[PDB]
Amino acid sequence: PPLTLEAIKDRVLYVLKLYDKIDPEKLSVNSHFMKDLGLDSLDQVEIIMAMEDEFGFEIPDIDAEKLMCPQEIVDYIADKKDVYE
Amino acid sequence: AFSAPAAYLTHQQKVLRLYKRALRHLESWCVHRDKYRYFACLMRARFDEHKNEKDMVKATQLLRQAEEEFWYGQHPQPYIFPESPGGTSYERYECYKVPEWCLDDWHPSEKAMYPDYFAKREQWKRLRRESWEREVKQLQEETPPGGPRTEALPPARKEGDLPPLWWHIVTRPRERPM
Amino acid sequence: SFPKYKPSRLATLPATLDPAEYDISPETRKAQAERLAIRSRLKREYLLQYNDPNRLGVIEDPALIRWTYARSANIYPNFRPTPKTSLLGALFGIGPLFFWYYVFKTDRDKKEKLIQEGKLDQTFNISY
Amino acid sequence: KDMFPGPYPKTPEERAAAAKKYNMRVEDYEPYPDDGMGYGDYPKLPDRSQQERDPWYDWDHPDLRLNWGEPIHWDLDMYIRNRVDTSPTPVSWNTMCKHLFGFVAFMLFMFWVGEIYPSYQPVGPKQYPYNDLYLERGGDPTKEPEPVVHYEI
Amino acid sequence: SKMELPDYKQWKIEGTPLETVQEKLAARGLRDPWGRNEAWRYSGGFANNVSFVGALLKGFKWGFAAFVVAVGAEYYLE
Amino acid sequence: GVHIEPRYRQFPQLTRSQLIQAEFFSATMWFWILWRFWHDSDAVLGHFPYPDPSQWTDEELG
Amino acid sequence: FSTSSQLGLMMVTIGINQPHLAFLHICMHAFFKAMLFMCSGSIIHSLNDEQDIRKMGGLYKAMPFTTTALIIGSLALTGMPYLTGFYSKDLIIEAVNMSYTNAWALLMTLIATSLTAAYSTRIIFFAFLGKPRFPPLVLINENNPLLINSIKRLLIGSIFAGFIISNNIPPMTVPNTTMPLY
Amino acid sequence: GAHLARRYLGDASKEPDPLRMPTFPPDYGFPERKEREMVATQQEMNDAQLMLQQRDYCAHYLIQLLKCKRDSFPNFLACKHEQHDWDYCEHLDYVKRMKEFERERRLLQRKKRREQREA
Amino acid sequence: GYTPDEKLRLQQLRELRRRWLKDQELSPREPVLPLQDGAPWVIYKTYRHSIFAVTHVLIPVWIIHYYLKYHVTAKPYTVVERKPRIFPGDTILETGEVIPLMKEFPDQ
Amino acid sequence: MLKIIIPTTMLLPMTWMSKHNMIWINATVHSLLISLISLSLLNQLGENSLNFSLTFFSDSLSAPLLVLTTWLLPLMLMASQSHLSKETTTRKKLYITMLILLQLFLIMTFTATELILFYILFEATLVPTLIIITRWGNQTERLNAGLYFLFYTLAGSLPLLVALVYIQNTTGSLNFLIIHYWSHPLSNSWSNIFMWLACIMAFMVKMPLYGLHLWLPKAHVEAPIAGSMVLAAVLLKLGGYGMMRITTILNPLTNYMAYPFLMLSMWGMIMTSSICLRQTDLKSLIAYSSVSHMALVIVAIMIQTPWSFMGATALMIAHGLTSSMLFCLANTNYERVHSRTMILARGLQTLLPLMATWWLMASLTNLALPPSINLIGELFIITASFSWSNITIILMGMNMMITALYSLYMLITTQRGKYTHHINNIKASFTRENALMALHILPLLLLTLNPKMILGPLY
Amino acid sequence: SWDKDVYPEPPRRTPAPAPQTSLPNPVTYLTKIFDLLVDRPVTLAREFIEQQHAKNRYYYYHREFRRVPDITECEEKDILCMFEAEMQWRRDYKVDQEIVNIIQERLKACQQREGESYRQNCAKELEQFTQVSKAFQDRYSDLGAHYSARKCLAKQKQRMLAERKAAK
C-alpha cells in the first residue's frame, strides 16, 4: 500500500464523482466546493466524512472545515500519510 | 499539521460539529449501509428544516436541545477510526518514533554505514542554521506590539527565506517509522 | 425530553450540555480572546526556544518548577494550625493507629487466652 | 525569586501579581481557600482529567496534553491519562452507581435464595461399602467402627 | 503492476437495497446523493452471501457423502 | 512479488488452495459429527425410570 | 469476554466438586479459543488493524479458511455434539443439573450457555455474513503458509482432540448414567 | 425439577428431605432386605488405587475396565463393552437411589395419613 | 477556509517536508563492514536439522539423564513414583496372582 | 578482622599519594580487592560466631553487611566519578577519604564485640556522611537536610549511651557474648520500660520509623549519589543490626513495649507506599519505598521470632542493593536532564534501551518478584507476622500491592510514553553507568541461588 | 547408598506386562530408542568418570563430638561450662531439626507413593510425624529468636511444675 500522490488524487476524484450533487464533468482538482460548485457547508461536512471513510483516517474538525477544495484534501491526506511522491 | 485554534467556535462551526458527531454516532447505531443512508438523509433534512432561521436566540435554543438529544442518543461505544484518539491503534507506533537529534550522538562507525544520508543531513543542518536569524527577524517584524494574539505563523515573505519555525514540523518523525 | 445528565465529580458536564455555552456575552468573547492571547504568547516563546538551532538542553518550564515547589516546599510555610487541619490531622494520623492497636491487641489476647486454656490447635505448628 | 509560589493573596494587588506569575487572567485566577492546608497562592484550576483535553490540538507535551507555561493542576499526577479519568460518561454517574450496586445486591440476594432452595435430583444418598469406607477414609483401624449397613431395594 | 481503479460509471443503485432506500426517501421527498459510492458493497461477488444456517452447513454435502460412503464400507465389510 | 494484487472495489483474488483446504476441513468436521452420531449416540443409556409399585418398596398400609 | 465466561464455567465445575472435568474443559478451551483469537487476528490484519465488527462484513467468501476455522471454533465453543466442546461443556452442564446445587447458580449457567451461543452468532453474523462494510481498498489475503498451517493444526485439534483425550484419559468421575431426557 | 416443585411450593412434610434421607428405618415395610453385596475386596480397591468416590458398590466393573484399558493400549476403543457394563451397574445403583427416594415419599405420606387418622 | 498566509505557509512546509522524506530514502549503497564459519554449502536440507536436533534435544537429554544418575543415588526420596496399579494379575518380583471373586452376575 | 581493616586504612594514604589521573582507578581496584577479601567472612560456623579477637567478632548477621559495605565502596566511587570531575584534586581526594573513613567505621561497627565501641563507631559515621551531604550536595536544602539527619540521629543515640553506661555499671560488661550468655530477664517497671525505650529508640531512628523518618527523605533527596547509596544500603541497616543485637537484653518487656512501634511500622508501611504513588520527585519516591521496607524490617525485629529475623537479614541486604541501584538509575537521568522531577523526562526507553532493562530489573526486585531475595525476606517476615496475628496479612498484602503499583508507575512514567520533545541532551549511556547497574543487579540475582548466605544467624 | 532403615521404602510390586491387543505398543519402542540413544551413552560416560574416580580414591570422615556437661550441671556465671553446654545444645537443636526433616520426607514420599489410597496407607508415617512434631514443639517451640539452653531449661522446668500440679 504505497498510497502514492496520484493514487490519493484518483481516489478523491473517485469519491467526488460518485457524489450525485456534484456534476462529474465540471469536477476538477481546483473546483472549490463552496464557490465553483454549488455545495453548501453540510455538503462540505458530508464530503469530508466520505473522504475519511474512504481512506480510513479521521480528519480533525478544525482542519476539516478549511479544506474547501479537492486538491487540498489530497495534499492534507499526503501530509498525514507522509506521501512524498 | 493542525491549524491554530480560534478563541471561540462560531455558531456555524458548532452546528457542523454537531452534524458530524450525529452522523458518526448514527452510523455506529446503523451498522448496515442502507439503513445508515436512509436515516442520514433524514438527519440532513432535519438540519435543513431550521437551516434558515432568522432569530439567533431560537437557533441557539435549537442547538442546545439538539445537543441534549445527542447526549441521550449517543452510542455507548461509538466507532473510532483505528488511528484516531481513542482508537485501537492510537499512538501504537509512538515508541518507534525517534527524534532526529539522536543521530548526532551516533558513533562515527555507525554514521559511516550510511554516508550519503548523513551528508544530506549536514546539508539540512546548514539550511536550518542559516535560516534561523532571518526567521527570528521576520517573526519580530510581523508580531504585533502587544504580542502574538494567535498561534498562526506567517509564511515566507521573500524567496530564499524558509517559513518561520519550520524545523520540527518538517523533520517530524515519520508516521510509521519502523 | 430525554433524561438529563447529572454531572458529578468523576463525570464532568459535557461542554455540549453546558448551560453557559449557549448564553454568551461580549465580555465572555473578550475574555476568550485574552486567554487565546496568553496561550499564543506562551507558545511563541516555547517554539522560539524549541526550534533554536543553538539550544542544547531542557527548556526550563517555570510552571513545572512552580508545581513541584508548591507540592513540596510551600506547604508548611503556608500552613496554619486550624480547627479543620488539627482535627483532620488527629483523626487521620492517630485514629488508624489506635484502631489497629484495638484489633491486634484483641486478637492476640484471645489467642493467648486459648493457649492458656489449652484450647488451641498447634499440632504441626513447629515453625514460627 | 517571585516566580516561586507564595502565600495566599489577600489584597487585590497580590491577586493580580499571582495571576501574572501563574500566566493566568486575573478574573480566571482563583486561589485555594485559605484554610491552612498549604495550598497558598497556587491556582485552584478546574478538576478535569487530562483525557478531557482536546486530543487534536497540538499540545506542547503530547502525552500529557499540556502546554509550556500553562498553570499545572495541583493534582496533575492524579489526573494524568493513565490515572483517574473524569471525562463525561454516556450515562449519569448516579444512575450507573444505582444500576451496578443494585445488580450486585440482587445477584447476592438471589444466591442466598438459591442456598435456601438448593437444586438436587430425586435420588437417595450414595451408598458406600465397608461402613462407608471408614477405613479407606482414615478411620481408626483398631477401634471398630459403628456398623453402617446398606440393604438392597 | 500499478493498480487501476474500476470505472466509476459502473456503480449503480439499481438492483440493490439502496434503490429501495431511495424509493422510500423519494416517497418522503428526500434524495440521497451518496448511493453510488456505497454501491460497490452490494455489487459483484460481494452481492451474494450465505445465511447463518448456510454458513454453518458448509461442507455438509460432502461430509454427508463421506459419511454415506464410510457407513457403506462398514456395513458391507461385515 | 505480487501474488494477490489488491483490488480496489472488487472481490479479492482467491487462490484455489484456500478454498480447497477450507472446504476439506469443514467437510471433515461434518463427517466427524455424522460418523460419531451414527456410531455412538449419547441421547440416553436407559430411560429415567420411576418405581411406581408400593409393594416394591413398602406397602404396609397400616 | 467469552474466555472469561468459560473460566467462570470451569469455576462452576470446581464448585460442583467435579475438578477433573474442569481440567478437561481447560484443555479443550485452549484449542478452540486460541483458534478463535487467531482468526480474529487474521481478520484484523486483512482489514488494516480494524477490530470493530461494524466495519467488517461479507468476509465469508473473502476469507474462506478463516471463516471455516471460526465456524468450527464457534460450534465447539457452543457445545456442538462430538466436537471438543461436547466432551467438556456438555458433561459440565449435565453434572451441574445432576447434583445438589445453588438454584440461581444453575439457572445462571444455563442462561450463560445461551448467551455464549448468542455472542458466537453476533461475531459470525456481523463479520462474515452480510455485505462488506470495510474501507474500499481491499487487501484481504489469507494465503500465507504460516497462517494457514497454524490455524490448520488447531482446527484438527478442535475437531478430534476431545474424542482422543476423553477416550485415553482414565475414568476419574462416576458418570451420570441415567437422567431425564430433557 | 418437579420434585423440587412439590418439595417447595407444596407441603414440605410430604416430600422427602434430601439431607435427612432416609428417616424411616430399613425394617419398616420391606419384610426381608438382603445386604448389598460388594464383589470387590477392600484390598483389591486399595491395590487398584481407585478413587474413594469411585470405591462404590460397582467397583468391580471399574477394576475390570481399568485393567482392560491398560492391556488394550495403544488401542483405546477396545473397552466399550466393559465401559457399558460399568455404566449399567451405575445406572442400577442410581435407580436404587431413586427407589429409596420414592419409598421415603410414600412412607411420609403414610405417616401423614396416620396423623389424619387421629383426626 | 484557509487564509492566504495559511495556504502559502502550508505549501512551503509541504515542499520542505517532501524534500526531507525523499532525503530519508536510502541510497543503493549501505556499506556493511565485511567468515568465522567456513561452511559454504552446511547442507541446508538436513545438516541444520540434525545439528539442531542433537544440540537442543540430544545433549540436554544426556545431561539430564546423567543428572538423574547423580541426584537419585545421592539423595533418598529425590524421585518418588506413584505405586503402579495392581489388578488381578501377575507381579514381576514375586509372581503373585489373584482373581476378583467373579461371583458377579454376568448378564447386564 | 584486621585483614580487612588495615587495607581499608591503607586506602587513604594511597588515595592521598596517588597521581591526579589515577585516584579513581587505584581506589576502585584496591576497594574491589578488599571486597574479595571480605568474602572469606561468609564462611560461618553454625553453632558459634567467628571470634577473631577480644575487640572484633563476626557472625552470620555481620558478615553479609560487611560484604555489602566493601562491595558498595567501589560502586560509590564509580558513581561519584562523573559529577566530581570538575572538582580539584584535593577535594576529590577528600571526598574519597570521607568514603573510605565511612567504610572503615561501618566495618568496625559491624565487627565490634562491645556495645560501647559499637556506639562510638555507629555515631562516628555521622561525621563523614554529614560532610558529604553538606559539602558536595547540589541544593540549598543540603544544609537543612544535614541538620535534620544529624540531630534526629543524635537525639536518638544519646539516651542509648546513657543506657549502655548504666548496663555496664549493673551487669558489669557490654561484650555481646557475655550479655547473651547471662542475659537476665527484664522486669515490667517504669525504669526498665524507659531503659527499653532508650535502647530501642536510636535504632528506631536509624531505621526510618513512621514519625521519625522525616530526615530520610530530605537527606536522600539532597545528598550526592554516593551519600544516598551509603545511606540506603548500609546506614539504615545499622539500626536493624543494633536492634537485633540489643534485643537480647530486653527479653520480656519487648512483648509489652512492641505494640506502639509494631502498629506504627505496620500502618506507616501502607502510608509511605501510598506516599510513593503521588510523589513528584524520583529520589523522594525511592526514599519513601526504603522507609516502607525498613518498616517491614522493624516489624520483623519486634516480633522476635527466628523466621522473622532471617527475613529481616535477607530484606536488609536485598533492599540495600535494590535501593542503591535505584538511586544510581535516577542519578543518571538527573545528570542528563539536571532535574529530579519525574514528569520532566519521559519515554527514555526509546532513547536509552539498556538503561530501560536496568530499570525494569530494579523495579521487579523492588516489588519482590520471586525468587528474589527481597521476596524471600518479605515472605518470611509475612509468615512470622501471620503467626503473630492472622490479621497482619491484610496490611502486608495491601503494602505489597501498593509497592508493585508505585514501582511500576515509576517505571511507566520515566521509561514509557512519548519522549519529551524539547530535551536534546540525552546521550548514549556510558559503559560506566551500565557497569554500575550490572554490578548492582548481578550479585542480587546470584544471591538467590545460595540464600543461606543472607539468611542470618538463626538459619 | 542411603540406608533403607533410615529411609524406608515399601517393596516394589510392579504388574507384569499382559498385552491383549495386536497393535504395537508405542511406549516400548520409544523406550528402546531412548535406551539406545541416551541411556547407553550416559552409562558409558559414567563408567569412564567412575574409573577416573577409582584411579584416585580419597576418603572424608564424619566428625564425632564427645558429649559435654549440660547446662543443668553448669554453675551460674560459669561462662566456660555455659559456652560448652550451649554449643552442645545448639548442635542437638540442629540434629533434632534434621530428624524432623527425615520423618517429613518419609511422610511426603508415602503420600506420593501410595496414590489415591494415601489417607489409609500413610497412617503409620503420619503417626510418627505427629509424635515427632509434638516432641519438637514442646522442646523448642516458643523459645524465640534468642533461643538458649537456659531458656529451654526454664521451659522444661515450667512444664514439669505444671505436671506436678496436675498430679496435685
PDB file of C-alpha atoms in Angstrom, chain H residues 3-72:
ATOM      1  CA  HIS H   3     -39.875 -32.961  42.847  1.00  0.00           C
ATOM      2  CA  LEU H   4     -38.397 -29.633  43.919  1.00  0.00           C
ATOM      3  CA  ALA H   5     -41.731 -28.130  42.883  1.00  0.00           C
ATOM      4  CA  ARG H   6     -43.601 -30.455  45.246  1.00  0.00           C
ATOM      5  CA  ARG H   7     -40.979 -30.032  47.983  1.00  0.00           C
ATOM      6  CA  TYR H   8     -41.029 -26.218  47.980  1.00  0.00           C
ATOM      7  CA  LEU H   9     -44.334 -24.996  46.531  1.00  0.00           C
ATOM      8  CA  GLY H  10     -46.297 -27.881  48.061  1.00  0.00           C
ATOM      9  CA  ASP H  11     -46.326 -29.375  51.527  1.00  0.00           C
ATOM     10  CA  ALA H  12     -42.758 -29.934  52.719  1.00  0.00           C
ATOM     11  CA  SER H  13     -43.684 -32.690  55.176  1.00  0.00           C
ATOM     12  CA  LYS H  14     -44.958 -34.967  52.408  1.00  0.00           C
ATOM     13  CA  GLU H  15     -41.810 -34.558  50.340  1.00  0.00           C
ATOM     14  CA  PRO H  16     -38.567 -36.202  51.500  1.00  0.00           C
ATOM     15  CA  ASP H  17     -35.681 -34.107  52.766  1.00  0.00           C
ATOM     16  CA  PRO H  18     -32.515 -34.977  50.799  1.00  0.00           C
ATOM     17  CA  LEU H  19     -30.082 -34.422  53.674  1.00  0.00           C
ATOM     18  CA  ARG H  20     -32.325 -36.162  56.210  1.00  0.00           C
ATOM     19  CA  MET H  21     -32.967 -39.170  53.929  1.00  0.00           C
ATOM     20  CA  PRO H  22     -33.626 -41.884  54.880  1.00  0.00           C
ATOM     21  CA  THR H  23     -35.528 -41.054  58.083  1.00  0.00           C
ATOM     22  CA  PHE H  24     -37.587 -44.244  58.249  1.00  0.00           C
ATOM     23  CA  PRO H  25     -35.754 -47.392  59.384  1.00  0.00           C
ATOM     24  CA  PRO H  26     -34.935 -50.153  56.883  1.00  0.00           C
ATOM     25  CA  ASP H  27     -37.023 -52.650  58.851  1.00  0.00           C
ATOM     26  CA  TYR H  28     -40.251 -50.708  58.286  1.00  0.00           C
ATOM     27  CA  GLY H  29     -42.033 -52.423  55.469  1.00  0.00           C
ATOM     28  CA  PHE H  30     -39.782 -54.496  53.229  1.00  0.00           C
ATOM     29  CA  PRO H  31     -40.085 -57.677  55.320  1.00  0.00           C
ATOM     30  CA  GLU H  32     -36.725 -59.070  54.167  1.00  0.00           C
ATOM     31  CA  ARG H  33     -33.933 -56.982  52.641  1.00  0.00           C
ATOM     32  CA  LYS H  34     -30.618 -58.525  51.647  1.00  0.00           C
ATOM     33  CA  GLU H  35     -27.359 -56.741  52.371  1.00  0.00           C
ATOM     34  CA  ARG H  36     -25.893 -55.056  49.315  1.00  0.00           C
ATOM     35  CA  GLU H  37     -23.066 -57.308  48.161  1.00  0.00           C
ATOM     36  CA  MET H  38     -19.721 -55.763  47.192  1.00  0.00           C
ATOM     37  CA  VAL H  39     -17.849 -58.072  44.771  1.00  0.00           C
ATOM     38  CA  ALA H  40     -14.620 -56.050  45.004  1.00  0.00           C
ATOM     39  CA  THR H  41     -12.468 -56.720  48.049  1.00  0.00           C
ATOM     40  CA  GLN H  42     -11.184 -53.788  50.076  1.00  0.00           C
ATOM     41  CA  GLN H  43      -7.583 -54.808  49.404  1.00  0.00           C
ATOM     42  CA  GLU H  44      -8.383 -55.033  45.688  1.00  0.00           C
ATOM     43  CA  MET H  45      -9.736 -51.476  45.670  1.00  0.00           C
ATOM     44  CA  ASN H  46      -6.665 -50.223  47.533  1.00  0.00           C
ATOM     45  CA  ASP H  47      -4.283 -52.090  45.217  1.00  0.00           C
ATOM     46  CA  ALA H  48      -6.045 -50.680  42.145  1.00  0.00           C
ATOM     47  CA  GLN H  49      -5.775 -47.148  43.601  1.00  0.00           C
ATOM     48  CA  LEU H  50      -9.443 -46.450  42.918  1.00  0.00           C
ATOM     49  CA  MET H  51     -10.654 -43.023  43.979  1.00  0.00           C
ATOM     50  CA  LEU H  52     -12.686 -43.027  47.178  1.00  0.00           C
ATOM     51  CA  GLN H  53     -15.683 -41.640  45.299  1.00  0.00           C
ATOM     52  CA  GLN H  54     -15.239 -44.435  42.744  1.00  0.00           C
ATOM     53  CA  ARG H  55     -14.946 -47.065  45.511  1.00  0.00           C
ATOM     54  CA  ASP H  56     -18.650 -47.870  45.362  1.00  0.00           C
ATOM     55  CA  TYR H  57     -20.792 -50.993  45.063  1.00  0.00           C
ATOM     56  CA  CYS H  58     -19.998 -51.058  41.316  1.00  0.00           C
ATOM     57  CA  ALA H  59     -16.222 -51.018  41.853  1.00  0.00           C
ATOM     58  CA  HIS H  60     -15.625 -54.442  40.274  1.00  0.00           C
ATOM     59  CA  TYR H  61     -16.705 -53.283  36.818  1.00  0.00           C
ATOM     60  CA  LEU H  62     -14.438 -50.254  37.220  1.00  0.00           C
ATOM     61  CA  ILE H  63     -11.489 -52.510  38.085  1.00  0.00           C
ATOM     62  CA  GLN H  64     -12.199 -54.639  35.024  1.00  0.00           C
ATOM     63  CA  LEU H  65     -12.419 -51.503  32.874  1.00  0.00           C
ATOM     64  CA  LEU H  66      -9.104 -50.143  34.150  1.00  0.00           C
ATOM     65  CA  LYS H  67      -7.370 -53.468  33.510  1.00  0.00           C
ATOM     66  CA  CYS H  68      -8.873 -53.750  30.021  1.00  0.00           C
ATOM     67  CA  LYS H  69      -7.799 -50.183  29.241  1.00  0.00           C
ATOM     68  CA  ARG H  70      -4.248 -50.867  30.413  1.00  0.00           C
ATOM     69  CA  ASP H  71      -3.943 -54.086  28.418  1.00  0.00           C
ATOM     70  CA  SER H  72      -5.613 -52.824  25.226  1.00  0.00           C
TER      71      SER H  72
END
